[PDB]
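Box 3.1. Reading complex inputs
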Amino acid sequence: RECDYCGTDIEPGTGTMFVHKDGATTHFCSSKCENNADLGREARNLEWTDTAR
Amino acid sequence: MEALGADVTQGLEKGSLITCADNTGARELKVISVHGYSGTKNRHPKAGLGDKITVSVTKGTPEMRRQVLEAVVVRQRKPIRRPDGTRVKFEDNAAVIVDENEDPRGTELKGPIAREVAQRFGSVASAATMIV
Amino acid sequence: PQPSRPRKGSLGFGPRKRSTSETPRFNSWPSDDGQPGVQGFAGYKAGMTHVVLVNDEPNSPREGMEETVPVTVIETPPMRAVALRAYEDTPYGQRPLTEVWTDEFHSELDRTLDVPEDHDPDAAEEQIRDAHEAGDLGDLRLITHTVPDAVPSVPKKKPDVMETRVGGGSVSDRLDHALDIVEDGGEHAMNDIFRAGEYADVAGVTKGKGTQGPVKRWGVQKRKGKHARQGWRRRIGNLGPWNPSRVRSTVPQQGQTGYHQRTELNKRLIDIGEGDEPTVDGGFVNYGEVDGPYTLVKGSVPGPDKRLVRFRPAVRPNDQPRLDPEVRYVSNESNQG
RNA sequence: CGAGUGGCUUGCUACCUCGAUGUCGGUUCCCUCCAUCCUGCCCGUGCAGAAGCGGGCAAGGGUGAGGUUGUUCGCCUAUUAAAGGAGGUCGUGAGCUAGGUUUAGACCGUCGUGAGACAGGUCGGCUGCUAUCUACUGGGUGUGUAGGUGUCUGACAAGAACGACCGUAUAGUACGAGAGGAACUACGGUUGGUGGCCACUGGUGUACCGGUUGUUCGAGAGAGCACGUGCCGGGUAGCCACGCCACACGGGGUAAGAGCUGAACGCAUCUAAGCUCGAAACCCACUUGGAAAAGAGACACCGCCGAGGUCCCGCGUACAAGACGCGGUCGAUAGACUCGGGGUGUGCGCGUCGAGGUAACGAGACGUUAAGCCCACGAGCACUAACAGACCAA
RNA sequence: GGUCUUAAGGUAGCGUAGUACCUUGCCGCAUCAGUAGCGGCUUGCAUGAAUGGAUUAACCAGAGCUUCACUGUCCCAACGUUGGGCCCGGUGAACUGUACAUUCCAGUGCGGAGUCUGGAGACACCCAGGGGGAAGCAAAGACCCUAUGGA
RNA sequence: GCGAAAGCCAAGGCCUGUCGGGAGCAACCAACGUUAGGGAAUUCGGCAAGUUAGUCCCGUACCUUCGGAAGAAGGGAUGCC
RNA sequence: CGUGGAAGUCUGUUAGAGUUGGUGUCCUACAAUACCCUCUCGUGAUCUAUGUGUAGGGGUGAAAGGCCCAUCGAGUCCGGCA
Ligand SMILES: [Cl-]
Ligand SMILES: [Cl-]
Ligand SMILES: [K+]
Ligand SMILES: [Mg+2]
Ligand SMILES: [Mg+2]
Ligand SMILES: [Mg+2]
Ligand SMILES: [Mg+2]
Ligand SMILES: [Mg+2]
Ligand SMILES: [Mg+2]
Ligand SMILES: [Mg+2]
Ligand SMILES: [Mg+2]
Ligand SMILES: [Mg+2]
Ligand SMILES: [Mg+2]
Ligand SMILES: [Mg+2]
Ligand SMILES: [Mg+2]
Ligand SMILES: [Mg+2]
Ligand SMILES: [Mg+2]
Ligand SMILES: [Mg+2]
Ligand SMILES: [Mg+2]
Ligand SMILES: [Mg+2]
Ligand SMILES: [Mg+2]
Ligand SMILES: [Mg+2]
Ligand SMILES: [Mg+2]
Ligand SMILES: [Mg+2]
Ligand SMILES: [Mg+2]
Ligand code: NA
Ligand code: NA
Ligand code: NA
Ligand code: NA
Ligand code: NA
Ligand code: NA
Ligand code: NA
Ligand code: NA
Ligand code: NA
Ligand code: NA
Ligand code: NA
Ligand code: NA
Ligand code: NA
Ligand code: NA
Ligand code: NA
Ligand code: NA
Ligand code: NA
Ligand code: NA
Ligand code: NA
Ligand SMILES: [Sr+2]
Ligand SMILES: [Sr+2]
Ligand SMILES: [Sr+2]
Ligand SMILES: [Sr+2]
Ligand SMILES: [Sr+2]
Ligand SMILES: [Sr+2]
Ligand SMILES: [Sr+2]
Ligand SMILES: [Sr+2]
Ligand SMILES: [Sr+2]
Ligand SMILES: [Sr+2]
Ligand SMILES: [Sr+2]
Ligand SMILES: [Sr+2]
Ligand SMILES: [Sr+2]
Ligand SMILES: [Sr+2]
Ligand SMILES: [Sr+2]
Ligand SMILES: [Sr+2]
Ligand SMILES: [Sr+2]
Ligand SMILES: [Sr+2]
Ligand SMILES: [Sr+2]
Ligand SMILES: [Sr+2]
Ligand SMILES: [Sr+2]
Ligand SMILES: [Sr+2]
Ligand SMILES: [Sr+2]
Ligand SMILES: [Sr+2]
Ligand SMILES: [Sr+2]
Ligand SMILES: [Sr+2]
Ligand SMILES: [Sr+2]
Ligand SMILES: [Sr+2]
Ligand SMILES: [Sr+2]
Ligand SMILES: [Sr+2]
Ligand SMILES: [Sr+2]
Ligand SMILES: [Sr+2]
Ligand SMILES: [Sr+2]
Ligand SMILES: [Sr+2]
């Protein structure tokens, strides 16, 4: 699988899956990505993220 | 009970306020007891995903308010572990009111449900829109 | 009438003091069922990683599906069985009779032992056989040592010596099997005794935590509410009643925590191999890089990294052996991050 | 109606203590009793089944969370296998609490001429001490057994190391007209307890990186201070639980009980002799400690002018002193450097853009730049430091 | 009862009260559950009018109760920070001491023993600890009674 | 900055709120920071802690002795150039 | 609508005065009444310095039997007194 935030290949047997109110599903590779996402930051705007570069 | 097929870290306690994910007329539920549970000294009795709980209706329609009914915990904010290692968590803590034969009191279920709760309570599954 | 509650901590691992030997000593051995063989092995703890595995249990609903299982990597290089000890059945229990040694000694063995120069392996062998004829032979065990030199991550070159039992068929046939292992050079591997999928018993001297209070040591409560702010936070209520006018050894008190021997039962051996397959990127934190003979033990193993752990075929297994599990993926991800 | 046991209730007495043995309830932590609430095994039934009712053995384990009340007790709610009782100075204030009782202030009611009283109510109202001995938890130093290293043995010691529940198949079957509805066994899980561990999830992380408010060093750059991080964001190692792993079966002997053979007593009789079975209880099994077990142990090798040990030195898988473990050039033990693996999130400077502004100036944007900065981990690497050298010893 | 003591015989109000023994009074509100709190009823053991009754906006480090919000008060504890604590140099008290003293289980004794009896256990010394016992230390009991005491 | 407020800094004063050295520095204690999910279940009692917060705009109930209640409540705004 | 600027008026660690809770710290103390946080009053029946008056069965007391030099339901000293 691939991270629905940063875009890196999630290591199998690792990570978290957040289930939104509507039913949408967001797979996260780390706590760092969950935190940046909860801050209201978008992956495309963060230079370190694979989606951006 | 039948194995959930997941390891749960109980996110609720006796006295906890949760959402009622159905069209019964009940909006907010209060956890009173957990079926089959027996704790230890000083421990607040814990409830989690897939547990059948006795509940109290806090907010809702006058006819549904103040009633003591049974319910099934359908969603929780605290993570659960799936056999493939991955952790899964929800937006809120929610439950579906149920009767004597484990059948839902309402007709329509609001919001998503965990696949593990579906395996255990079949009539709740075949009433759910989204199963994650 | 004040609620009941089980006591704080177990009384079966007492006294909670420092271990005499850092090298674990088994107090029990498996039965004599199959063919003659050495009843144990040893290695050095490396660290942890996860593995993806295919479910082996026929009674499990998830049979055939991919399951993520935690694993402790232990470097298990070949050991040397330098001697064979024989026990006699005296009215005071089992007492050591004689020992049969070798000529081929590992170069760095003189760091622990006073290496034999003049020995008689034939006369000692005869003594054991006369004791077998007399019907007074107890059991046969092999004096064994590790080669920490073969492990680059472990600083020690001083071999860890331990005794291991030989169990099997008849007493006559296992006496001969024991002598054959010894005579060569005593070189044996994990493969010789264990197979992947087998349940083993892992013994180890735990992580040393020095002196700790009753809360950490015995799992007692902290003072609650108002009682927490008076000058007493993590101290027990009382040391006992008025009568008996003494403090019982059963009351939870401060002292040594950690560095005790533990024998963890029924540990499934996921895989035995040789190579750089279980290594973590950037090396295992506070250990190093694994590139040699190893074992993947399911779950946790007592003791810290670099510590000598011991293996024994399960004396009390619950499940039936499900040999050679299908390992689809081994994590090589960095333990830093 | 009669006979008792206990010492939990109350009463009686006035033996002990008035140069003081702190007091109700609660809390916390430990041991125990059985008159057993649940769990195990049994007998009876007004025992079809299911569910009960009554009785026997049995104290291994368990017996929980909450609403009023200072309450003990109790009433009440929802869970539960069940939510048993009692002793330990009504266990426990040189442990805690101060709500109650129990001073000095005050009010109300009642009584009193009054001061004042109340075995009534009510608001407020103080809790000292550096442990000598002993006791236990852990840690050392000596002596004994009488040179050293390594490996063991097992007298004894501790354990609950496991207890309990739900579900599935059995089976909608046995049983019963029907309603209803089991078990043996085999499986999956949950719960409480227990021991250990950190790959994974989570917490911390006043290491570290970044944003940024006030002020000070003229601005810039870069810094100090704002409590022992100014605040906010992220967070490695480690330590952790809210995370993860592990914790039988089976033997042996019994209790209540079910029986066999069997006599006294030609029969009968589970008992008198003998025997087969049979409890979560007992013993073993399993884990932990354990040569100071005074019968003070065993084996093997090294050694008595030399085996080994100590000091010293570099360090931790160890650690409050002491102890323990590893390495010491025949070396990777620690540091430096370089990689790797990680944290943050794009450096200073310069270029272009930039709302405007005549210009001066200009918050900011992009590029250079996965940049800059940093790391409690790993690898490489003898470059620096593990040098020099002393002592004890049959 | 349909007067009598001793003059009158409780009027407005308020009322289970900071006054109500019975008492967790009854009904209701609220809660899963409310000896609480509030409302109503109220025969008030033994309310009540300047021994002031009642009512009340405002005020309050006054007493009780409820809701929203918040949170380590709790479930259940973890990690960290600073000063101690520990080791070293220097400085350097006090409380306390009939004697003896390694105790433990039972017993006995003025009935609540480290010291008596019977057993069990116990090699000596030292370090750290939390305080079970010395009916621990500190105070010729504040309570109770007593004295031909005091104020 | 509203300020004789906080915080920072001069002039001036001081390192004499006068014992030091060492251990990643253990238990335990005093002060304190942060804790997932839950959210008063704790307790006699939210004790302790926390939450809110400055300023402007909108808006503000019962009751009232017409003063008050009231900053009721509630909602929005807030920097730099 | 403005002006005006009243108040035993409000907020306020302004100075200053006081002392609610923590039943925190201390309790052979720093201290024979201390330390910290919290809290109250802060234009008035306000707070404060100095000077001065009231004396022991007497003062003084917005009253607690409070206070009258660590001494108060009758101060302290010496004497009566052995
Ligand atoms: Cl419950
Ligand atoms: Cl407590
Ligand atoms: K007394
Ligand atoms: Mg409790
Ligand atoms: Mg990690
Ligand atoms: Mg990661
Ligand atoms: Mg009985
Ligand atoms: Mg018992
Ligand atoms: Mg009582
Ligand atoms: Mg008592
Ligand atoms: Mg006590
Ligand atoms: Mg006390
Ligand atoms: Mg004390
Ligand atoms: Mg009270
Ligand atoms: Mg009171
Ligand atoms: Mg009433
Ligand atoms: Mg005492
Ligand atoms: Mg006296
Ligand atoms: Mg008196
Ligand atoms: Mg008199
Ligand atoms: Mg929290
Ligand atoms: Mg409670
Ligand atoms: Mg408070
Ligand atoms: Mg004057
Ligand atoms: Mg008085
Ligand atoms: Na204290
Ligand atoms: Na009797
Ligand atoms: Na009595
Ligand atoms: Na007493
Ligand atoms: Na008590
Ligand atoms: Na029992
Ligand atoms: Na109660
Ligand atoms: Na006591
Ligand atoms: Na008490
Ligand atoms: Na006290
Ligand atoms: Na048996
Ligand atoms: Na006032
Ligand atoms: Na805290
Ligand atoms: Na003295
Ligand atoms: Na003591
Ligand atoms: Na008097
Ligand atoms: Na006017
Ligand atoms: Na104060
Ligand atoms: Na006088
Ligand atoms: Sr052994
Ligand atoms: Sr043993
Ligand atoms: Sr206190
Ligand atoms: Sr005693
Ligand atoms: Sr009995
Ligand atoms: Sr039963
Ligand atoms: Sr409560
Ligand atoms: Sr009662
Ligand atoms: Sr008790
Ligand atoms: Sr009190
Ligand atoms: Sr009074
Ligand atoms: Sr009274
Ligand atoms: Sr001797
Ligand atoms: Sr069934
Ligand atoms: Sr049916
Ligand atoms: Sr600072
Ligand atoms: Sr703020
Ligand atoms: Sr029998
Ligand atoms: Sr010996
Ligand atoms: Sr009347
Ligand atoms: Sr009045
Ligand atoms: Sr102490
Ligand atoms: Sr200056
Ligand atoms: Sr000085
Ligand atoms: Sr943080
Ligand atoms: Sr409450
Ligand atoms: Sr607002
Ligand atoms: Sr004023
Ligand atoms: Sr108080
Ligand atoms: Sr102090
Ligand atoms: Sr004091
Ligand atoms: Sr405080
Ligand atoms: Sr003020
Ligand atoms: Sr005199």
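In summary: Residues 6 and 220 of chain C are 11 Å apart (CA to CA).
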